[PDB]
Amino acid sequence: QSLKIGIVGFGNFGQFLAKTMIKQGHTLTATSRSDYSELCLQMGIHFFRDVSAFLTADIDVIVLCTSILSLSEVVGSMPLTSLKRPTLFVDVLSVKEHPRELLLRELPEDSDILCTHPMFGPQTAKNGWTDHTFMYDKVRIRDEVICSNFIQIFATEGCKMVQMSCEEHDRAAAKSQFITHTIGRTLGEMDIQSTPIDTKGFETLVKLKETMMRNSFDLYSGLFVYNRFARQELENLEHALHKVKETLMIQRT
Amino acid sequence: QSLKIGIVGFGNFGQFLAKTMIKQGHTLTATSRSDYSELCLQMGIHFFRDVSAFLTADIDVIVLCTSILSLSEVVGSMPLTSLKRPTLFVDVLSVKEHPRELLLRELPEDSDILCTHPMFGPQTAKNGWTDHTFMYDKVRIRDEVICSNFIQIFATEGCKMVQMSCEEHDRAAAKSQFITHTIGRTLGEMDIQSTPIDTKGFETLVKLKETMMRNSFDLYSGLFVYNRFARQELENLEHALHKVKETLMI
Numbered sequence: 001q002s003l004k005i006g007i008v009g010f011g012n013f014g015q016f017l018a019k020t021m022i023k024q025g026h027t028l029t030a031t032s033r034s035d036y037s038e039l040c041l042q043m044g045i046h047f048f049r050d051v052s053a054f055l056t057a058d059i060d061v062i063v064l065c066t067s068i069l070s071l072s073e074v075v076g077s078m079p080l081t082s083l084k085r086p087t088l089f090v091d092v093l094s095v096k097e098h099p100r101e102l103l104l105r106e107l108p109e110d111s112d113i114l115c116t117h118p119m120f121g122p123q124t125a126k127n128g129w130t131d132h133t134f135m136y137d138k139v140r141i142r143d144e145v146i147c148s149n150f151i152q153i154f155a156t157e158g159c160k161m162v163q164m165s166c167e168e169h170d171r172a173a174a175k176s177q178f179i180t181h182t183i184g185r186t187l188g189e190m191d192i193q194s195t196p197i198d199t200k201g202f203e204t205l206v207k208l209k210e211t212m213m214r215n216s217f218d219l220y221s222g223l224f225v226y227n228r229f230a231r232q233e234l235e236n237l238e239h240a241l242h243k244v245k246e247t248l249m250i251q252r253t
Numbered sequence: 254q255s256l257k258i259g260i261v262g263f264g265n266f267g268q269f270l271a272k273t274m275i276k277q278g279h280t281l282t283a284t285s286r287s288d289y290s291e292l293c294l295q296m297g298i299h300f301f302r303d304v305s306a307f308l309t310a311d312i313d314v315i316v317l318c319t320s321i322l323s324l325s326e327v328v329g330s331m332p333l334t335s336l337k338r339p340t341l342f343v344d345v346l347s348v349k350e351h352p353r354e355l356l357l358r359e360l361p362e363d364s365d366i367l368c369t370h371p372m373f374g375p376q377t378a379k380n381g382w383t384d385h386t387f388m389y390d391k392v393r394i395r396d397e398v399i400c401s402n403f404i405q406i407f408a409t410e411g412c413k414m415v416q417m418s419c420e421e422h423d424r425a426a427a428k429s430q431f432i433t434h435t436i437g438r439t440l441g442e443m444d445i446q447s448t449p450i451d452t453k454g455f456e457t458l459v460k461l462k463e464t465m466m467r468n469s470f471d472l473y474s475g476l477f478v479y480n481r482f483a484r485q486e487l488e489n490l491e492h493a494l495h496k497v498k499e500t501l502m503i
């Protein structure tokens with residue numbers, strides 16, 4: 001079950017995955033917009049600056065770890081016919097309908113597709129992946145063996161494994177993750193500060209601002225722009241706040 | 254060190270305080286708008302249906318545990334001039350400038366005033382008060398011994414003891430507790446539910462919503478109406494959310 005895994009987008013998340021993958025014994029290759037050559041040398045990863053070169057490497061699985069906003073450009077510019085053989089493409093974007101559509105549209109037909117969302121990251125899984133949730137949709141899988149072996153990377157780490165459609169994920173995520181990021185950004189904008197009399201609830205909010213804020217704005221933009229279900233949730237949040245606020249006014253009166 | 258403590262407003266919080274007070278060996282009695290005779294029986298303490306009888310008892314400390322909204326009605330209705338002796342009044346309202354101003358205005362001059370806010374409750378302190386915060390302001394203390402003994406109730410339970418002015422409390426509380434409740438209430442209106450793919454952060458929010466919603470609307474109302482700093486904080490929240498929305502809409 002040891003795999004040759006190639007990572008596209010060697011940013012914070014890609015790096016986070018790579019650490020565990022290396023620990024498990026997989027052999028890694030990576031490519032990215034920015035230069036990660038030294039970090040890759042440290043880690044034992046074979047880095048290719050140029051995507052064309054990356055695509056000719058001996059890879060079982062290609063994992064797309066770029067930002068949600070950039071996936072279209074990135075995929076669009078890969079010379080996919082450079083692929084030596086049919087390969088599983090995995091995405092890990094925080095939204096799911098979009099990578100699914102793009103990959104189905106853009107990839108060679110004979111390449112498999114696994115759309116995933118590990119519902120955790122460096123800020124929330126500092127000490128291991130156990131009991132963190134890994135969502136996946138087997139969008140186009142023919143080589144079950146390779147697909148299983150990849151999914152096992154998460155399973156062996158103790159993740160709660162959830163198989164779900166990309167649509168179902170976006171629906172759920174809009175109601176849950178998107179809202180949470182939104183509150184977290186709002187708290188960030190407020191620059192909330194600990195006080196000498198924090199409630200436990202306030203404490204958790206301060207922690208939330210901290211974790212939510214350590215994500216890129218591109219990431220949080222992606223959650224909204226590319227989830228068709230997000231806009232309604234944002235309205236629901238506003239509507240709810242206003243409902244509460246008016247009830248207060250009625251009480252003032 | 255043992256005190257005769259009388260609770261006014263035997264609701265959720267007053268019951269909560271009483272449990273611990275009883276455990277410590279104080280002698281507790283209660284009075285309230287509603288009839289808590291049975292619950293008091295179960296708990297082992299004497300309930301006074303009428304406030305006059307409560308007031309004429311042998312009592313060392315009266316703890317005001319009514320809602321913030323109701324404190325003025327309650328106090329204004331108590332026949333205060335029936336007290337046998339000078340007595341320490343403690344409030345535990347979630348806002349502090351109002352009870353301070355009210356008590357100073359309305360109480361007999363010889364009665365002491367300790368204004369407090371335990372920053373915890375039955376939903377956050379199920380397993381003990383240890384390391385939860387207790388805020389207090391010694392507004393009008395002449396009998397330091399009784400006042401110290403009362404304070405010790407919190408200290409001996411391991412509370413983080415914080416002495417502060419009522420104004421500072423209300424300023425801080427507006428930025429923290431009130432915001433938290435408002436966010437919790439908003440989430441309640443949305444009726445947020447757990448999903449199969451909850452993030453850790455979302456899980457914290459579902460919990461917060463569940464905890465915040467267990468308070469009375471009266472309590473939440475109270476945080477807003479009687480904290481002069483609250484309204485600006487609501488504005489800050491509302492404005493921030495708007496700002497965030499603008500970055501997205503672009």
Ligand SMILES: NC(=O)c1ccc[n+]([C@@H]2O[C@H](COP(=O)([O-])OP(=O)(O)OC[C@H]3O[C@@H](n4cnc5c(N)ncnc54)[C@H](OP(=O)(O)O)[C@@H]3O)[C@@H](O)[C@H]2O)c1
Nearest residue numbers: 009010011012013032033034066067068070093094121216
């Ligand atoms: N906890 C997490 O962070 C987490 C958890 C689950 C899923 N995800 C998902 O994992 C992906 C990566 O997340 P992230 O946290 O590392 O941060 P991110 O800001 O969403 O994405 C960063 C990566 O995107 C690349 N990138 C951005 N714009 C690009 C462009 N125009 N062209 C080419 N590459 C571009 C960056 O490349 P360079 O570094 O080379 O410049 C970097 O590798 C995202 O899709 C995110 O939704 C993240």
Ligand SMILES: NC(=O)c1ccc[n+]([C@@H]2O[C@H](COP(=O)([O-])OP(=O)(O)OC[C@H]3O[C@@H](n4cnc5c(N)ncnc54)[C@H](OP(=O)(O)O)[C@@H]3O)[C@@H](O)[C@H]2O)c1
Nearest residue numbers: 262263264265266285286287319320321323346347374469
């Ligand atoms: N975790 C907490 O709940 C917590 C923590 C810290 C401080 N506090 C404070 O403790 C006080 C009590 O809180 P709570 O949680 O028990 O709930 P609450 O809804 O704020 O207040 C309930 C109490 O108020 C009494 N009351 C309400 N309206 C009244 C009226 N018009 N006339 C006479 N009595 C009236 C009720 O009397 P009856 O039950 O007899 O009807 C009950 O004893 C509040 O000031 C609150 O801010 C609460």
